[PDB]
RNA sequence: CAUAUUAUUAUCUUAUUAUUUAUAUAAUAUUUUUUAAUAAAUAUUAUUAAUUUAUAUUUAUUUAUAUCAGAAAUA
RNA sequence: UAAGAAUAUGAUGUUGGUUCAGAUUAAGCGCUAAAUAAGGACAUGACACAUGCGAAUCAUACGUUUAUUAUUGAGAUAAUAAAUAUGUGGUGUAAACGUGAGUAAUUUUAUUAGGAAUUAAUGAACUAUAGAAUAAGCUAAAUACUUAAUAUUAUAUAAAAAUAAUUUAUAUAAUAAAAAGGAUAUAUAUAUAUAUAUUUAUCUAUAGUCAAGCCAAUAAUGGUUUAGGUAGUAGGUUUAUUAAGAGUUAAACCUAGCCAACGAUCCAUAAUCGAUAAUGAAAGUUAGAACGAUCACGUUGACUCUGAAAUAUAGUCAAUA
């Protein structure tokens, strides 16, 4: 029997699902588009480049 | 994985749920160019208090459990400590039983000497009765009464010598003429030498 | 024998702070019972403001413990 | 890729110390000294410090103040220009820089392809997506402060197995915790509101980055002419506190342990290390100035607030000047 307040087994290894990691870390805009303004365009270009990378 | 060590329980029963485990590791001492054993004593948690001094146990790393306790017994590899306690307990009764038995035997032998020769032989030989014959009975016959132990020893010794010499002679004879040994091997059922000796030894 | 620094305490003193009992016609808000000056329509009815009252949050007061640091003693 | 030499002895061989030949420096000193390129520069008093600088910035947060035009009659409001940070606000100073006093391991350093308590409904500040951004009160006003509105864990049911626990899914319970507006355009209507937008801000949630807290193993100077040390001491069981284990800190109860001649405890001394420097044939030894890494401190001590993280170069109290 292991100590009273301890865990018998080492913690459960949590493997990475790369599809889910991408889905949550970098999700694309679910709205189709907005496509107005200037800084908005700059930000859209930057965001798509960052996501692609 | 967790740090694991193999060690000997060197002190148990002096602390509640804690034992002392002596572990050894291989180190290289460059000052003397030698592979040495580095020794250490660990205070180790023992839930259930199952370990005893002299057990070989595997200790595993845990969370800090006290100021100095960071390991717990994970498995009893060898349990000589428990066996020692078992034999300690058993010998107490085991010894005392035959200690009383042989004291009884000593007292009985003393009494036999207490209530206890040539006169009897004189009476048996001359009267060959005046109320003494049955009195002797209560204790061809002169010989069997005078029967030393050495004679049985000599008979047994001659029997032993005869058995050994006959076995060796028969073995040598069978190993000499090797047709009849085959006859006997198929009668009773380089290994053939050992099997032949087996059959000859059971033969007598 | 004299001077100096460091540590310790069944000792004394102790800023500050944190806990800790107990006290406030102690305050500021909400709750009452009431007393005051305004309002409006036609005896008021409501507002703002004090009295008493009982829950929070603070201050003052102390009780107890610990505590920078000193003093005395010991090393 | 390992070399020896001089000096004993009347002479010899041997022991044995002393010294020398080589390289070097965080170097000083004596004598001397042309130019250029590069690398460094208080090792001592963490001794005391004159003077000047090293952390400001934002006016598109809120307030002020002027000048012209327009309408209104000392002023009021718009539009356009400006000035204002000695008023309220925000962000920025836990970093970097310097220093080596303390620190010999109770939280320090180094290493490991080490762990769990299975480190919190924590983001500090940028990504990627989403959704929000509501009322009063208080200040002169506000993106300043208050109050209010709205937005993982514990249970139980099963499932499995990386199993004598964890993980998964579900259903509840509470989560239940915020905010912020400015600058420009226009579009409506009746200067007033409003509706959109373009800007840059605010808040919340998820994931990612960057990061924090704790523990283990091994190693880390001299003196035992410091030999016994230790009573929270060693261990057990609870409670409190913490995101989190543990005599870590506080309280209670127990057991009688724990360390130590392979060196405890005590004392002294010292920042530590490298793919850094020196040296050597090499093992090693030395340094820890420079380059880099880590720690500690910012006149001395303790405590507290804020904060994810501070006994902070902050604040409080005291000491010193
Ligand atoms: Mg314990
Ligand atoms: Mg001489
Ligand atoms: Mg020389
Ligand atoms: Mg230069
Ligand atoms: Mg200096
Ligand atoms: Mg130095
Ligand atoms: Mg302005
Ligand atoms: Mg200002
Ligand atoms: Mg700093
Ligand atoms: Mg530095
Ligand atoms: Mg130092
Ligand atoms: Mg407002
Ligand atoms: Mg705000
Ligand atoms: Mg302790
Ligand atoms: Mg505890
Ligand atoms: Mg206690
Ligand atoms: Mg010692
Ligand atoms: Mg020093
Ligand atoms: Mg050194
Ligand atoms: Mg350096
Ligand atoms: Mg320097
Ligand atoms: Mg400091
Ligand atoms: Mg100074
Ligand atoms: Mg200080």
Swiss-Prot record, chain A:
Disulfide bonds: none annotated. It is found in: Mitochondrion. Component of the mitochondrial small ribosomal subunit (mt-SSU). Mature yeast 74S mitochondrial ribosomes consist of a small (37S) and a large (54S) subunit. The 37S small subunit contains a 15S ribosomal RNA (15S mt-rRNA) and 34 different proteins. The 54S large subunit contains a 21S rRNA (21S mt-rRNA) and 46 different proteins. Present with 2010 molecules/cell in log phase SD medium. Component of the mitochondrial ribosome (mitoribosome), a dedicated translation machinery responsible for the synthesis of mitochondrial genome-encoded proteins, including at least some of the essential transmembrane subunits of the mitochondrial respiratory chain. The mitoribosomes are attached to the mitochondrial inner membrane and translation products are cotranslationally integrated into the membrane. Belongs to the mitochondrion-specific ribosomal protein mS26 family. This is Small ribosomal subunit protein mS26. The lineage of its organism: Eukaryota, Fungi, Dikarya, Ascomycota, Saccharomycotina. The chain holds residues 54 to 106 of 318 of the full protein.
Swiss-Prot record, chain B:
It is found in: Mitochondrion. It comes from the Eukaryota. Its main location: mitochondrion. InterPro entries: NA-bd_OB-fold, Ribosomal_uS17. Keywords: Mitochondrion, Ribonucleoprotein, Ribosomal protein, RNA-binding, rRNA-binding, Sporulation. GO terms for cellular component: mitochondrial inner membrane; mitochondrial small ribosomal subunit; mitochondrion. One of its GO terms (biological process) is mitochondrial translation. One of its GO terms (molecular function) is rRNA binding. Component of the mitochondrial ribosome (mitoribosome), a dedicated translation machinery responsible for the synthesis of mitochondrial genome-encoded proteins, including at least some of the essential transmembrane subunits of the mitochondrial respiratory chain. The mitoribosomes are attached to the mitochondrial inner membrane and translation products are cotranslationally integrated into the membrane. uS17m may have a meiosis-specific role as it accumulates during the middle stage of sporulation. Present with 2810 molecules/cell in log phase SD medium. PANTHER family: 40S RIBOSOMAL PROTEIN S11 FAMILY MEMBER, SMALL RIBOSOMAL SUBUNIT PROTEIN US17M. Belongs to the universal ribosomal protein uS17 family. Component of the mitochondrial small ribosomal subunit (mt-SSU). Mature yeast 74S mitochondrial ribosomes consist of a small (37S) and a large (54S) subunit. The 37S small subunit contains a 15S ribosomal RNA (15S mt-rRNA) and 34 different proteins. The 54S large subunit contains a 21S rRNA (21S mt-rRNA) and 46 different proteins. This is Small ribosomal subunit protein uS17m. It comes from Saccharomyces cerevisiae (strain ATCC 204508 / S288c).
């Amino acid at each position: 029997k292991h100590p009273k307040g301890s865990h018998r087994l080492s913690p459960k290894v949590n493997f990475i699902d790369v599809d889910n990691l991408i889905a949550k870390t970098v999700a694309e805009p679910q709205s189709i588009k907005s496509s107005n303004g200037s800084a908005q365009k700059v930000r859209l270009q930057k965001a798509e480049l960052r996501r692609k990378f | 994985a967790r740090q694991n060590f193999l060690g000997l329980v060197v002190s148990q029963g002096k602390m509640q749920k804690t034992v002392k485990v002596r572990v050894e590791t291989k180190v290289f001492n460059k000052k003397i160019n030698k592979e040495l054993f580095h020794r250490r004593d660990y205070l180790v948690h023992d839930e259930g208090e199952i370990s005893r001094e002299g057990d070989l146990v595997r200790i595993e790393a845990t969370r800090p459990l006290s100021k100095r306790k960071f390991f717990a017994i994970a498995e009893i590899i060898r349990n000589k400590g428990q066996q020692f306690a078992l034999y300690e307990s058993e010998a107490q009764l085991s010894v005392a039983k035959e200690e009383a038995q042989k004291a009884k035997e000593f007292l009985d032998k003393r009494s036999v000497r207490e209530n206890k020769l040539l006169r009897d032989i004189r009476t048996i030989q001359d009267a060959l009765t005046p109320k003494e014959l049955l009195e002797i009975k209560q204790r061809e016959t002169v010989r069997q009464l005078l029967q030393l132990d050495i004679s049985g020893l000599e008979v047994n010794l001659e029997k032993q010598r005869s058995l050994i010499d006959r076995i060796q002679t028969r073995l040598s004879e069978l190993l000499s003429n090797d047709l009849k040994c085959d006859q006997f091997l198929k009668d009773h059922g380089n290994i053939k030498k050992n099997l032949l000796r087996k059959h000859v030894m059971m033969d007598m």
